[PDB]
Design a protein around this ligand. Sequence first.
Ligand SMILES: Nc1nc2c(c(=O)[nH]1)N=C(CCNc1ccc(C(=O)O)cc1)CN2
Ligand SMILES: Nc1nc2c(c(=O)[nH]1)N=C(CCNc1ccc(C(=O)O)cc1)CN2
Lengths: 264, 264
Amino acid sequence: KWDYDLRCGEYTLNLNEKTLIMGILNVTPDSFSDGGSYNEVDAAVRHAKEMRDEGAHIIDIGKVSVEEEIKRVVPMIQAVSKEVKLPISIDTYKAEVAKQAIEAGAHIINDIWGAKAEPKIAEVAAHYDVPIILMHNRDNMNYRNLMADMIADLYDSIKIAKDAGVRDENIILDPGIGFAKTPEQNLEAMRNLEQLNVLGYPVLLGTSRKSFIGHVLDLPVEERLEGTGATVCLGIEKGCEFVRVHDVKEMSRMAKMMDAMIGK
Amino acid sequence: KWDYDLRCGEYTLNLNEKTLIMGILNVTPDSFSDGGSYNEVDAAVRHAKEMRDEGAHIIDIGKVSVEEEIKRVVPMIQAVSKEVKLPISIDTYKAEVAKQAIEAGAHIINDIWGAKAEPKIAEVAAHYDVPIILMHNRDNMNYRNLMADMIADLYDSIKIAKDAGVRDENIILDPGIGFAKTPEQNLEAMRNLEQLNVLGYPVLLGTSRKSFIGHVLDLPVEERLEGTGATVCLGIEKGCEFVRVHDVKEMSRMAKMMDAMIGK
Ligand SMILES: Nc1nc2c(c(=O)[nH]1)N=C(CCNc1ccc(C(=O)O)cc1)CN2
Ligand SMILES: Nc1nc2c(c(=O)[nH]1)N=C(CCNc1ccc(C(=O)O)cc1)CN2
């Protein structure tokens, strides 16, 4: 179906073969420090290595100053990238930040403002020639038509991407769950993911432990595994490529089961 | 969508409102007895009551002699029916058995040979006027066309049903996972559940902990929760009505999440 791979440095991800799990590195902050404390990182490396072991195929590393985020995250990318043999994605909207990460050893860029926040980002994706993820997100929540608007808004991201010079191969789409959407907006979007596909790019769907699960099911964050299940399952028969989850053990076994049913 | 309810004795189930969970009562046998030992039953009642508490809306009670099955199960139906305020379904292919159960207080009849095993069953459904579940199942596994054959075979069940005099309202369909199917047959059937719907009757899908999950994922029975997840999720967006599971807590939260996504 996809005839192209996610060439990304020393690694490459194959879209046809299986659903590709992105593991959320939870960036618990050693407050007494801004930078690479031993606990801070070890703890992070401990937790990636784990996820390596859980079936996860990429690691995600999430008003605050740039400088910090750079001292925060540049010594962290650098341990894991050097310790864990998998591609590593940065979770920033900042271009000054984007650079440093990829400079550290970061692989795929994950943006929650989809080149809108700081256009300069896209240029940097161009430059180090690396996949970027664009997310739907906005600063009000007035939609004539949820989807039609999403798909619009997504499109004015791709514009900047493609204008700055990102190859189509290096572009990924994220519907951006829990951003700028009431929890009924979130549902509808889940109901109608599949129209993200007309647009001809991989979709990554991020729903682990999200507050709409708790709106429906009425159960809080540490009891949201099952919710996350369904969103990932429906997520997938609707043809999405990556899912970005916390619970790697459990979702990884849900991916593979759907992957065998829909015959992926 | 359905304009009719599952009138079933003192109870009634509404098909539009939510996915309807059937809970597997696991009939651990006090071997030193054939009949209603105190442990035997208490243990059963302990476990239904639990499932009452887990979100489950019907209780399922599964070469061996009739007489036994009757002494086995007639004092058990009778506790739970009298202790747990929900509809209760019998898991037999025998008509002599069918009677006794419903006589005890049983509600909905679950058959794994779909009126084929002992046609007389269907007559009894007629007679006590109660829903019956028909399952696809056979005694070889040669199919020209999986589906087309399933759907055929299902149809020659409905024939007996409808001939003996079962109203269409009281008929339910089960694709019969892990019966007469290689684990690739099972997958394909899951892939193409939705064609069970042309036939115009509720579908109940039974996959909890089934061996095809373990063929795919390669994990045995007590590690099969996630598998069961996906089968139930995909199960449902494909428009099935009941799922018959062991893990009521967990699947019940997967039902409700899909139920909110597909807008059911
Ligand atoms: N590409 C991508 N990046 C992300 C995402 C996401 O879904 N996709 N979510 C993230 C979670 C942070 N924001 C939220 C956290 C929770 C919720 C909610 O519970 O609804 C909504 C938003 C962070 N970064
Ligand atoms: N209506 C209905 N009745 C049932 C079912 C079922 O799926 N639907 N399964 C049952 C499980 C018993 N048989 C099997 C048990 C395990 C497996 C397997 O692991 O593949 C296959 C079959 C018993 N009764």
